[PDB]
Design a protein around this ligand. Structure first.
Ligand code: HEM
Length: 450
């Protein structure tokens, strides 16, 4: 039975000032590197424990001992995501119902139905890059976000955001990013009732209205005229026979569009970054892309044969898991690793970037980008790789995300050579999800028609 380490406290503010940064997850990684596999973190009125080792995280991932909790971050996201799937307690009224109703929208049959829409948007991206002049460059994170929002819009809702017909981000992206930024600010605010924050609160309500205005256009357009929206509006819970309430449906739509703005866009941006920084890996992916993608547009079967592209995407998720933390609570009194006693309700945070750098399960070379790590998935120890979370509360979008990401990276490397023309230094923007900031490249067309 050991005493848990804790970083510097600041009187009544406890540890809160340590995360007074634009990069709090990166700050928590530095604390983990100082204090080791577990440390206590206190803020006014709340305590959590950050886990960094596979040894402790494997116990946290035991669903008989631990269930999902909402971090302060996820609690604030309920301001516009409500009790959608991601921001619901496991035993809250709409979690199990929504989970059951939306399950067949991620079926193998659903995935085959989505492929044609993913190709539509991927073709738009390739055509944009083909039409750039010699003196121009690509804003990588920006164009990856255009693609992922358009893909979930078309695949999920038969709605065209038409992000490639806009120089600035779609108003929905502008408002969602501004809302996510306000939540990052709220996590650092000790005195939220201060009148100095009245303008912030007004702007927050305005951004929530813009997002709700778009949800109205998606529903109106469906009324005017078989996908995720069909299942939301018409699907009934097989257990109870009850459909989703109109209010919950709206929260689910914004939740799935949030997957469109953050997550897959981060992965694709991180993936291209690692490729331009590791030219031998880029050459290998370019060779696979050329060999497998023999048709003008990729088939479902051809995307499944892009094996090394899959390994590249997994190695991007290892180093920079784009959803970097998930939170759990002790269902009963328990002892973590035979050293740390927890009371019922005690909260733990899985620091995924630190888990993915645990030398005891990954070896010495944890900082090296080596997709060859994932040549044999079965050789990776249990609970050593958790970019999609854990158990019944794990990502339902894993297959969707990796299919989209494989298709896009495959086509990109089939159609273009890439130059890191500015010698870009990785700068990671944090919104409770991770994405490169200011990442720019030049593309050279291989002149292969679509
Ligand atoms: C690289 C891409 C993605 C990553 C890394 C990712 C990661 C995650 C993680 C870690 C969680 C668990 C969060 C927690 O325990 O608090 C999660 C939940 C979820 N993800 Fe994903 N995700 C990705 C793509 C997607 C996509 C494309 C969709 C939808 C189309 C999606 C929908 C969801 C939903 C609805 C949940 C909540 C599930 C529930 O609790 O019932 N994700 N995701």
């Amino acid at each position: 039975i050991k005493e848990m380490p804790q970083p510097k406290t600041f009187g009544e503010l406890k540890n809160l000032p340590l995360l007074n940064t634009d990069k709090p997850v990166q700050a928590l990684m530095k604390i983990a590197d100082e204090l080791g596999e577990i440390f206590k973190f206190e803020a006014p009125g709340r305590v959590t424990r950050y886990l960094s080792s596979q040894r402790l995280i494997k116990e946290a991932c035991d669903e008989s001992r631990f269930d999902k909790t909402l971090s302060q971050g996820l609690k604030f996201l309920r301001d516009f995501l409500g009790d959608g799937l991601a921001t619901s307690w496991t035993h809250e009224k709409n979690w199990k119902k929504a989970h059951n109703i939306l399950l067949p929208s991620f079926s193998q049959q659903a995935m085959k139905g989505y492929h044609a829409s993913m190709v539509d948007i991927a073709v738009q991206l390739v055509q944009k890059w083909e039409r750039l002049n010699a003196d121009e460059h690509i804003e990588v994170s920006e164009d990856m976000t255009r693609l992922t929002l358009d893909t979930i819009g078309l695949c999920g809702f038969n709605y065209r955001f038409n992000s490639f017909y806009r120089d600035q981000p779609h108003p929905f992206i502008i408002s969602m990013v501004r809302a996510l930024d306000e939540v990052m600010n709220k996590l650092q605010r000790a005195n939220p009732d201060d009148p100095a924050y009245d303008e912030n609160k007004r702007q927050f309500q305005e951004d929530i209205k813009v997002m709700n205005d778009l949800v109205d256009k998606i529903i109106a357009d469906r009324k005017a005229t078989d996908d995720l929206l069909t299942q939301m509006l018409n699907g009934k819970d097989p257990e109870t026979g009850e459909p989703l309430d109109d209010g919950n449906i709206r929260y689910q739509i914004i939740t799935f569009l949030y997957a469109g703005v953050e997550g897959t866009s981060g992965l694709l941006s991180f993936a291209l970054y690692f490729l331009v920084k590791n030219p031998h890996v880029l050459q290998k992916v370019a060779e696979e892309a050329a060999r497998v993608l023999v048709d003008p547009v990729p088939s479902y079967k051809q995307v499944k044969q892009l094996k090394y592209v899959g390994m590249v995407l997994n190695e991007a998720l290892r180093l920079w898991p784009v959803v970097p933390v998930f939170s759990l609570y002790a269902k009963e009194d328990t002892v973590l690793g035979g050293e740390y006693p927890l009371e019922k309700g005690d909260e733990v945070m899985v620091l995924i970037p630190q888990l993915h750098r645990d030398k005891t399960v990954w070896g010495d070379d944890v900082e090296e980008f080596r997709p060859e790590r994932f040549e044999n998935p079965s050789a990776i120890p249990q609970h050593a790789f958790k970019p999609f979370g854990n158990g019944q509360r794990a990502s339902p979008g894993q297959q969707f995300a990796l299919h989209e990401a494989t298709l896009v990276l495959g086509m990109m490397l089939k159609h273009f050579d890439f130059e890191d023309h500015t010698n870009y230094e990785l700068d990671i923007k944090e919104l409770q999800t991770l994405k490169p900031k200011g990442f720019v490249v030049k593309a050279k067309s291989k002149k292969i028609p679509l």
